[PDB]
Amino acid sequence: GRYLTDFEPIQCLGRFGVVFEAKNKVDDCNYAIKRIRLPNRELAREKVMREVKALAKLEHPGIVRYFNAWLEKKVYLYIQMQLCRKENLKDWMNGRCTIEERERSVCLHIFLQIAEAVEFLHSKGLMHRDLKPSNIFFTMDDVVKVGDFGLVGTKLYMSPEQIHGNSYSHKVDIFSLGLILFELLYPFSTQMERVRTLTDVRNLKFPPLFTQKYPCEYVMVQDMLSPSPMERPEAINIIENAVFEDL
Numbered sequence: 001g002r003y004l005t006d007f008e009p010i011q012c013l014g015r016f017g018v019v020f021e022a023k024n025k026v027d028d029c030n031y032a033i034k035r036i037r038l039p040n041r042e043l044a045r046e047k048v049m050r051e052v053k054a055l056a057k058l059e060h061p062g063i064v065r066y067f068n069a070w071l072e073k074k075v076y077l078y079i080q081m082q083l084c085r086k087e088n089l090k091d092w093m094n095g096r097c098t099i100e101e102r103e104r105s106v107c108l109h110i111f112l113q114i115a116e117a118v119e120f121l122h123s124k125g126l127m128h129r130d131l132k133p134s135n136i137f138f139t140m141d142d143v144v145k146v147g148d149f150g151l152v153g154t155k156l157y158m159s160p161e162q163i164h165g166n167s168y169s170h171k172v173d174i175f176s177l178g179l180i181l182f183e184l185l186y187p188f189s190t191q192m193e194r195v196r197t198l199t200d201v202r203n204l205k206f207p208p209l210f211t212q213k214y215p216c217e218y219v220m221v222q223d224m225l226s227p228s229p230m231e232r233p234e235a236i237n238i239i240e241n242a243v244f245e246d247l
């Protein structure tokens, strides 16, 4: 409706719902537009609409810039966000499979922006719940952005309690961050080596070369991956960790 009227579709970017790249006819900018099927039940609908009003207030360097939300008639909710690069963080790591291509400083600076975005959210009483490299983005200016979240794939980055449907808190994001930090610092040759190693890391089994090369990050990651959520550090403790002192 308003979508087909005010926008020219360019391509599907992903399919929780569907995300399209599309160009606004009036301002000629390209945007990522998320379309979700709105719940039929009235109470369940109001839940979604409350989440939208909360997220639309958020403004942070690590949060994708927001533009607009509207409904169209079955009802569809449309969310218009800034279009990020096609190369997400998963792609970024895929094209960089050697140590030399994963410079310590560039990697930590990437992780740090993720962690700061997460700390911002937690401080607002929100959590991300969906942190993983395929859902971490770069703007056209190369600012790191946490990806889509708010309204609820691989479970590889998902905390135990979140996988098993147990009660959970913002500590679930800390678990994800831990695995992402390791993955940032430890390139893989093959997809299968990636899965074999990551599942081991979830279980606190690390490659010796990692522990020796990154003794401090190793200890951080160990803590963030505690099976017990209470034991994981707060996002603020992580951001303040000595490992990030070289600015």
Ligand SMILES: Cc1cccc(CC(=O)n2ccc3c(F)c(-c4cn(C)c5ncnc(N)c45)ccc32)n1
Pocket: 013, 014, 019, 032, 033, 034, 052, 055, 056, 057, 058, 063, 064, 065, 066, 069, 079, 081, 082, 083, 084, 085, 137, 146, 147, 148, 149, 150
């Ligand atoms: C209503 C509202 C306001 C502010 C923030 C949010 C939550 C949020 O970060 N997002 C909501 C939909 C969404 C979202 F669809 C993308 C996105 C997905 N894909 C595949 C992309 N590719 C390029 N650029 C993007 N921005 C994206 C990123 C973030 C998104 N909600």
